Every structure is written in C-alpha cells, then in structure tokens.
Structure 1
Amino acid sequence: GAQVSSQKVGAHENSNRAYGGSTINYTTINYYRDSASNAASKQDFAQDPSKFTEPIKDVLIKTAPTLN
C-alpha cells in the first residue's frame, strides 16, 4: 500500500543520485482508516481564473474591440 512519488529537487548535490534513481523519490504509506488522519499530499492542481477575471457572457478577444 505504499505510494511512491518523486520530489522536485531544488539544490543539487554533486551526485548522480541528485538527478535520478529512488534517491529523488519519496515513499508514503497510510496507517489510518479515516482519510482525516492522512497528511496532505500537496500534489495540488490549478485552474482557469476566467470565472473571476472574465465572467462575461459574450467572450471577447484582447486584440479586438471590447465595446462593439
């Protein structure tokens, strides 16, 4: 039940282990039945800001005149 993800290496050691292998991976295993007990995975996604930045009914191009 182990989950193996890879790390985003910031500072690199003068090793090939700093660039590949299990040496740039980390392992995770959940010990509790309730999902609330789990830690945060932090592999979180993003989205389009459009719902806030452009909640416009009739879609407009920036090059084209906004007021038409």
Structure 2
Amino acid sequence: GAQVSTQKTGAHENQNVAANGSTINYTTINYYKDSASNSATRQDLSQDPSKFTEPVKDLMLKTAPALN
C-alpha cells in the first residue's frame, strides 16, 4: 500500500519541470496506526498573500489611483 511522489531535483537532474524520468520517485509506506507518526507532509506551495497585503473591501486595481 505504498504511495509515491516526485523527488525534488538535484545536481544531475532534469529541468525544473521534474517531468523527465520515472527515476525521480520517492516511495513511502506508513508503519503506524496514528497519522501523527507519519513523516512530514508534501510541500504545499499554495499561497494567498492578499489576506495580508491587500485585504481591502473595495476592489482595488494597481493601475487605478489607489485613492478614488
């Protein structure tokens, strides 16, 4: 019941696409009943900066004057 994922690239690896070669492949099995025992999660690169940098109720555009 192993899961697999793409390994992060290294010195002799392919381009940043990481799509070239089935050989880039880390395989893992969880051995414990509590998921707290599992290794760390997959990188989550999802980002949402607007929450902190642009939490404006009004719709603000960058080209529009900020004021008006």
Whether TM-score is above 0.5 comes out as yes
Which runs of structure 2 are paired with 1:1-68 in the superposition (5 Å)? 1-12=1-12, 19-21=20-22, 23-68=23-68
SS in 1 for 2:52: helix
Q: Which amino acid aligns with 2:44?
A: D
Structure 2 residue ranges without an equivalent (≥5): 14-19
Q: Name the count of aligned residue pairs.
A: 62
2:43 and 2:66 mapped to 1: Cα distance? 38
> Within 2, Cα distance between the matches of 1:58 and 1:4?
44
Q: What percent of counterpart residues are identical?
A: 76
Q: What's the counterpart of residue 17 of structure 2?
A: none
Q: Provide the rounded CA distance (Å) in 2 between the counterparts of 1:43 and 1:27.
A: 16
**CA deviation string 1:21-57 (max 9, x = no partner):** 2x21010000001011011033323221101101111
Richer in helix (by share):
1
User: Unpaired segments of 5 or more residues in structure 1?
Assistant: 14-18
4+ runs deviating over 2 angstroms: none
CA RMSD of aligned residues (A): 1.6
Supply the distance in 1 between the matched residues of 2:56 and 2:21 (Cα, whole angstroms).
Answer: 46
Scaled by the length of structure 1, the TM-score of the pair is 0.78
